Design a protein around this ligand. Sequence first.
Ligand code: HPA
Ligand code: HPA
Lengths: 338, 338
Amino acid sequence: TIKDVAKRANVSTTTVSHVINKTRFVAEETRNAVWAAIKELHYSPSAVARSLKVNHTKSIGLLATSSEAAYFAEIIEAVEKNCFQKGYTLILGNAWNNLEKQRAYLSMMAQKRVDGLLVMCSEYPEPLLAMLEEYRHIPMVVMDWGEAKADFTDAVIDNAFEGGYMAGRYLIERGHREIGVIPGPLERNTGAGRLAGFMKAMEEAMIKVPESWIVQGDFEPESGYRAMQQILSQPHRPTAVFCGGDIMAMGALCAADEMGLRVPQDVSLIGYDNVRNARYFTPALTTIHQPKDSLGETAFNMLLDRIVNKREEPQSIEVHPRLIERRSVADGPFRDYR
Amino acid sequence: TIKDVAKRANVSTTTVSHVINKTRFVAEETRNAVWAAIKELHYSPSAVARSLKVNHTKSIGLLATSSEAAYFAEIIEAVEKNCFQKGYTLILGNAWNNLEKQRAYLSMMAQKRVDGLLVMCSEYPEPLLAMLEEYRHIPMVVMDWGEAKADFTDAVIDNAFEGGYMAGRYLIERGHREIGVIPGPLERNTGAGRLAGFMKAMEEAMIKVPESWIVQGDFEPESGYRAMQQILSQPHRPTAVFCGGDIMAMGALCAADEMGLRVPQDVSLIGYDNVRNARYFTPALTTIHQPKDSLGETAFNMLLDRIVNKREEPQSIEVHPRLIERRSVADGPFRDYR
DNA sequence: TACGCAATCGATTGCGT
DNA sequence: TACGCAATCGATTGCGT
Ligand code: HPA
Ligand code: HPA
């Protein structure tokens, strides 16, 4: 088809090319003629032909976990923004935390020869770790670790620990001493990390959280429900609860409200993520806000760097969470005694 | 690189090829040798080289509006599922309801030569309509119209009208006669369509909704807030409100709760979408459920059809909404008089 | 029997004139 | 000056032997 244009415009295709990419000077008329032909033939040059020659497809692969989850969703849209903004195309793939699915996705990506890879798999067993290395040749950045687990990738790090710590303290400083927690999967950073940060703050306070008061969630609203329910279901109940993520949090609000418990008057609840619509939770949710957009953009940027500036040494950028006060938290019994 | 494999295995590349795609019989040993080389060289065959020859990239383009919105998000994940399931790769692009962005996205897609196109642009002005036709050559299906607006595409249709109608009736049959509505953008199907279905039911009932009682939303929680607020802010207030989408609905719950209004005891609220986490709204939201997954899959399927079975005649499949009773609705003053 | 030769898909780009 | 020739990127596939 490029031959077709050339022919119409009676010039070599080489010409057609250069004019199409202003890659060397071309006589006005000549230029015009080509643009003309280009238009009548209704010409769209093949990127694949081009990619074949130039050796990069101007496309990036996002090997994600799930894309419906608010948290996820939000990050993704960000990344997309950035890609578009710099001419990259997004290939979205969800491995659902399934090795086989992930091996598959990975392979198609290499095959389609994505310029770089954005990795957000949530959990990282050695088998997953291993696979990834097999493709160290393709530039990648993991956006979901607590610290850098490998030498062959870039990494953006969220400080989940300090975020949890922030959550504990607030509660502490607000009058609370009987607290409970519903964490996300321990096999994840946003799970374990948050918990542990939250647990340090407690030890520092000589606060002991009885095990009947800690209940694992899976970042899903339903899990949030069940936990809150198992917590308030007990003889002795905490006066405040720290919930690992806003959506399970939202799940937690439901239950309370269902047993006729009051928020925050009967229970204060503090979340984690500051998801786009947390403010509209009821009550408006107080939570730790995670920089999702920066989290996206920042990742894209390291990728581009390696890609263009051909860096080879893995890097790692940290990002920081921060408390957002809404109305799901109330003074605790010890506020006055501080 | 295919030459590299061949050489290692001392066979023509033609061989390497056939064994790689079991496209003709090959001596075991021969086969083995190639697999061997394939492994040592750590070989991944280029899809782009391949695509160049075979003429289809096994990739599909989703020209969407926004991907963070719950409704959207949910559909997208679906589509992705389907693509993966049949070896297609997803290129996600969000035009934000911006012509220029959409022209751009469209063009890159043609260029990257996507096998087909999934279209979800929300609003369709002639300029957008026009652009689309320009690419009638690439197979596409619009997943967001009320009826088929063009002869060059397939279309999946949701019955937003009958959905709205269902919403009105329920309210009617539940004792209500003073109702208000906060619709989404009229420039959209899920906006206008829902409204009108909802408005028919009302006329049929000889119910008149005073204009101070209808307030436009933009499908976003914030909009939901403001509207509900403007509605309950009045001297005379409805006893029931129909909200165009679950997220604005959620927005509506906030406000009420903020002015100390009760749901559903002071106001019944019925939504639209049955978004994944509507049940965990508080109270659990009664709403019309839209078949998102079928909406996805069904679209993918028409695409594949045109694609593979090389159909040429546009088709159109309808899908159906259905009421889901939760707890945001209460009997109205006229329930007993029916 | 089981395999290979050579042309081809659509672009780009180094030498030249 | 302003443009063109021919080789090339990595695969596939129709004829043959
Ligand atoms: O893995 C996760 N899933 C959903 N929401 C989350 N918020 C933090 N981590 C997660
Ligand atoms: O355009 C829309 N946006 C968000 N949610 C929606 N639910 C139906 N239509 C829409």
